[PDB]
Design a protein around this ligand. Structure first.
Ligand SMILES: O=C(O)CNC(=O)C(=O)O
Ligand SMILES: [Mg+2]
Ligand code: NI
Ligand SMILES: [Zn+2]
Length: 331
């Protein structure tokens, strides 16, 4: 069995290996990369996502989200308070202001310490989930707006033709902006490219141990657990590495820098934070190996998780027993 300790693997494809996306994903899995839940892919030196970022400040963040925390430093939830629209230029200036800027630090480890110590005492503003792409249309390799669609994959594997579309999303971050513990919708893969700026630290639980994290989360967030049998789908709960280690939960960590891709694998729980002003692009995708995870994915039916149009068909075809209850949650 490849990668039996479920370590995060880092890949350095050549320019030739970077041509066929699906083939490279399947290669990484042949080496056991999925067992970690997360892999890093460093593009060949000849590749670029676009020519420059000199012209992005006019993008609009229509609904910036202020991430307000409740709890204790290692075990907290966050809620998103909607703020007035601002441009990326405005948001960058805000990120760099004395109130929001990254503090002086020695290295990534010192910064990680500071994040876990102090996160809850601040409310950083995240420009998340913005439909769009920063890949040049002429970038032919690993262009996250030109991937094969999940609808087409389900059609190829299962023969059924369904409605829905699959487009990328931009994320503008600042110091302390946080992504809560989650798997993807329908336990899909994700791919995330850090276009520019400061790093992003990731934490991940191997898919084979995801239920250990869920059981801890039910213990740590007992009201939430009574409200919903899949409350991590609400994407609000944080648990620190120290707390994970105290409770024997297997996990790994890695820091993504600008110019790097990360892939999350089906049912790989992940969480993390941004080091400073940055911009990432991400999208969900599927492979044939996903289909069995899609069929078994938990679902939030309490009404909180509220998701895209395209998840309807995935539930309807892969989980017909659950469909009626899940759709009641959506409506
Ligand atoms: O970058 C972020 O804030 C969160 N991204 C992801 O969870 C992902 O790419 O799957
Ligand atoms: Mg612009
Ligand atoms: Ni994710
Ligand atoms: Zn719910």
């Amino acid at each position: 069995a490849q990668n039996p300790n479920c370590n995060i693997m880092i890949f350095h494809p050549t320019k030739e290996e970077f041509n066929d996306f699906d083939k490279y994903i399947a290669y990484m899995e042949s080496q056991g990369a999925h067992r970690a839940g997360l892999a890093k892919i460093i593009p060949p030196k000849e590749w670029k996502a676009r020519e420059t970022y000199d012209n992005i400040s006019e993008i609009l963040i229509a609904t910036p989200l202020q991430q307000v925390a409740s709890g204790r430093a290692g075990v907290f939830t966050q809620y998103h308070k909607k703020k007035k629209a601002m441009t990326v230029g405005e948001y960058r200036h805000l990120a760099n202001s004395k109130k929001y800027q990254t503090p002086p630090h020695q290295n990534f480890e010192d910064l990680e310490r500071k994040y876990w110590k102090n996160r809850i005492y601040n409310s950083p503003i995240y420009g998340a989930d913005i439909s769009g792409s920063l890949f040049d249309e002429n970038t032919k390799q690993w262009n996250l707006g030109h991937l094969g669609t999940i609808q087409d994959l389900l059609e190829k594997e299962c023969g059924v033709v369904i409605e829905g579309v699959n487009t990328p999303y931009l994320y503008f971050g600042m110091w302390k902006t946080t992504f809560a513990w989650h798997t993807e919708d329908m336990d899909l893969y994700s791919i995330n490219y850090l276009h520019l700026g400061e790093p992003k630290t990731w934490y991940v639980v191997p898919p084979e141990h995801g239920q250990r994290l869920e059981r801890l989360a039910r213990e740590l967030f007992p009201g939430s657990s009574r409200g919903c049998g899949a409350f991590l789908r609400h994407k609000v709960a944080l648990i620190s590495p120290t707390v994970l280690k105290e409770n024997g939960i297997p996990f790994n960590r890695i820091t993504q820098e600008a110019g790097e891709f990360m892939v999350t694998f089906p049912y790989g729980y992940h969480a993390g934070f941004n080091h400073g002003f940055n911009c990432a692009e991400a999208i969900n995708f599927a492979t044939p190996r996903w289909i069995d995870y899609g069929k078994m994915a938990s679902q939030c039916s309490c009404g909180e998780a509220r998701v895209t149009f395209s998840m309807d068909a995935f539930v309807r075809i892969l989980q017909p027993e659950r469909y009626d209850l899940w759709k009641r949650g959506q409506d």
